[PDB]
């Protein structure tokens, strides 16, 4: 049966994980994806004590709701391509800490953000520094035996499965894999269905959200350009058996749980249509 | 860093995992590989309670000594190729329970036994049943996001990297990888150094021991046909950045602790001559 998860930032903001995990179970999800983003509050998770780490493991084992993956979007703030050597070193230290964290709490996959730089302008130097930082991250990941899976991004350097496969070929490492976002993939000039089929033996997780050209965030399900039934059809037929994660940001909604319930039923209807 | 690890059965027996991990720490090992073999005793680990599983996580985090991998030799007794449907079901159940155990406890890689059958003679039907059992196993691993790694075996069906690569290509799944034993890879008529280069983007871990033509188990370090310095050179030059696990049964043989320290330094000496 198909594992279905919810993004952390879809649910109420608390740092009590047992409550967060119990809520996910109640809403019918098998898992939660943790965000380690640009904010200092989530960034501080990497400096958690042994007891804070073991408390998360406790809540997981007790509720049965897994935290198999981490979204590492902190690299938008501290990119690995930064020609500011201080910022780049901060980005690699965050990579090191996310992997140790992953080891500590049994996170299966760290989703990488494919930005060479975000708030600054890319050039050849940012692309070379990003590539080297990726090799270095993947080396750390080989030692720890932790999967780093590159997201297909809201950003041209990594805006297709083909571009992620380029990096995968260059790296040639079993611990570097693919985590496509079917929304991000659908908002450029890609052949989406061929891209999905092309990545198959590299795809470890799928992000599920709607988008429009140039709009990658908070676009409501059904109001964008993503052909969900087609994407699930292709993935199923091509032999994909991994998890799907509903990505939304309803932490700011009046009733986060009610929004998540509606999004879950909407996504599930389309999975069912496509044979799953 | 080269992560160096020690097989469970190279250390004194029992179920206090805290003491064992502590022992491996003072001996200078980064990690311990757990065994889930043919004994009811070790199989009952798959039936541990949430509390037993948590106590193991606690000890790992306390000591800093990881348990990143599991040797799953239990399939010799309950093979996936068995023409006895009841024996086959048991092996599949074991596979399922091992994946969940790996989830609960944060094990990175489950090392699979590459035998269609072991105590019976193989035929087209056992090969077929083993093939479909593997596929079922890999689908379970994809949902859970747990790596299953095929060991290079003391058995003709999987006696090279090439054989494991054949299965890897057939399965075309990121959760099926490769776990070469350089002893077993050397105990046949293989081109060893070619094999290790061939498998490189699939190799997640490496078993280190010594063997002879025909003889597979416990030949002391240096007395077999394994060219350690050359194997370590091939892997170093090819871009391997993963762990090495020293396979020993010291738990029997004289002063177990003093034997693993000799073999630890013997392995490290061979690695250092190879550029490492
Ligand atoms: Zn490929
Ligand atoms: Zn996404
Ligand atoms: Zn291959
Ligand atoms: Zn071995």
User: What string of DSSP letters covers B86-100?
Assistant: HHHHHHHHHHHHHHH
What H or E segment, with its residue span, contains residue A178? strand A176-179
- Cβ within 8 Å, pair B142-A241: yes
- Cβ within 8 Å, pair A144-B203: no
Residues in A closer than 8 angstroms to B105, CB to CB, are: 106
Closest of B72, B79, B73 to residue B131, by C-alpha = B79
- Cβ within 8 Å, pair A58-B62: no
- Cβ within 8 Å, pair A145-B105: no
CA-to-CA dists, residue A103 to A57, A208, B19, B55, B232, angstroms: 11, 26, 21, 16, 26
Calpha distance B74→B36 (Å, rounded): 6
Residues in chain B: 276
Closest of A73, A8, A6 to residue A34, by C-alpha = A8
The three-class DSSP label of residue A115 is coil
CA-to-CA dists, residue B15 to B25, B48, B111, angstroms: 17, 12, 21
The DSSP secondary-structure symbol of B222 reads T
Sign of CA dihedral A20, A24, B105, B241: negative
Mutate to test the interface with B, among A30, A174, A245 (most CBs of B within 10 A): A174
Tokens 């980064």 correspond to: B30
**Are the CB atoms for B163 and B111 separated by under 8 Å?**
no
Calpha distance A233→A199 (Å, rounded): 15
Burial (0-12, 13-18, 19+ Cβ within 10 Å), A85: exposed
Calpha distance B150→B167 (Å, rounded): 9
Residues in B closer than 8 angstroms to A205, CB to CB, are: 145
User: What string of DSSP letters covers B189-200?
Assistant: S--HHHHHHHTG
Tokens 């989530």 correspond to: A42
Discontinuities in chain A (C→N > 2.5 Å), after residue: none
Calpha distance B273→B5 (Å, rounded): 19
**Are the CB atoms for A90 and A226 separated by under 8 Å?**
no
Calpha distance A33→A109 (Å, rounded): 10
Calpha distance A57→A229 (Å, rounded): 35
The DSSP secondary-structure symbol of B73 reads G
Residues in A closer than 8 angstroms to B108, CB to CB, are: 144-146
| E-only strand ranges, A28-137 | 31-35, 66-72, 109-112
As given in the structure block, the two tokens for residue B97 are 């329970």
B126 C-beta neighbours (distance < 10 Å), count = 21
The CATH number of B1-276 is: 3.20.20.150
Calpha distance A149→A114 (Å, rounded): 10
Please give the order of strands across the beta sheet that includes A4-7. A176-179, A147-151, A109-112, A66-72, A31-35, A4-7, A244-246, A206-208
Calpha distance A171→A176 (Å, rounded): 7
- Cβ within 8 Å, pair B173-A201: yes
**Are the CB atoms for A43 and A74 separated by under 8 Å?**
yes
What H or E segment, with its residue span, contains residue B109? strand B109-112
The three-class DSSP label of residue B220 is coil
Calpha distance A151→A207 (Å, rounded): 9
Buried b (16+ CB within 10 A) or exposed e, B191-216: ebbebbbbbbbbbbbbbbbbbeeeeb
What H or E segment, with its residue span, contains residue B42? helix B40-43
Give strand pairing partners of A147: A109
As given in the structure block, the two tokens for residue A210 are 């709607």
Nearest to A242 among B57, B105, B143 (CB): B143
Taking the CA atoms of residue B174, residue B175, residue B180 and residue B185 in that order, the dihedral angle to the nearest 10 degrees is -80
């Amino acid at each position: 049966q198909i594992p279905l998860g919810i993004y952390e930032k879809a649910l109420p903001a608390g740092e009590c994980w047992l409550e967060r995990l119990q809520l996910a179970k109640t809403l019918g999800f098998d898992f939660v994806e943790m965000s380690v983003d640009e904010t200092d509050e989530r960034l501080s998770r990497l400096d958690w004590s042994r007891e804070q780490r073991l408390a998360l493991v406790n809540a997981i084992v007790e509720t049965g709701v897994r935290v198999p993956s981490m979204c590492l979007s902190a690299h938008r703030r501290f990119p690995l391509g930064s020609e500011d050597d201080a910022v780049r070193a901060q980005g690699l230290e965050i990579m090191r800490k996310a992997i140790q964290f992953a080891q500590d709490v049994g996170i299966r996959v760290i989703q990488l953000a494919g930005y060479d730089v975000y708030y600054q302008e890319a050039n050849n130097e940012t692309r070379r520094r990003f590539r080297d930082g990726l090799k270095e991250s993947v080396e750390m990941a080989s030692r720890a035996q932790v999967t780093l899976a590159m997201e297909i991004m809201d950003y041209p350097l990594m805006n297709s499965i083909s571009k992620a496969l380029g990096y995968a070929h260059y790296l040639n490492n079993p611990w570097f894999q693919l985590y496509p976002d079917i929304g991000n993939l659908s908002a450029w000039d890609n052949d989406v269905q061929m891209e999905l089929q092309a990545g198959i033996g590299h795809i470890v997780a799928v992000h599920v959200k709607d988008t429009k050209p140039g709009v990658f965030k908070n676009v409501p399900f059904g109001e964008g350009v993503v052909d969900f039934e087609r994407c699930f059809e292709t993935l199923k037929q091509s032999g994909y058996c991994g998890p799907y994660l509903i990505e939304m940001w309803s932490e700011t909604a009046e009733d986060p749980a009610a929004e998540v319930a509606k999004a879950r039923d909407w996504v599930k209807a389309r999975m069912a249509k496509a044979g799953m």
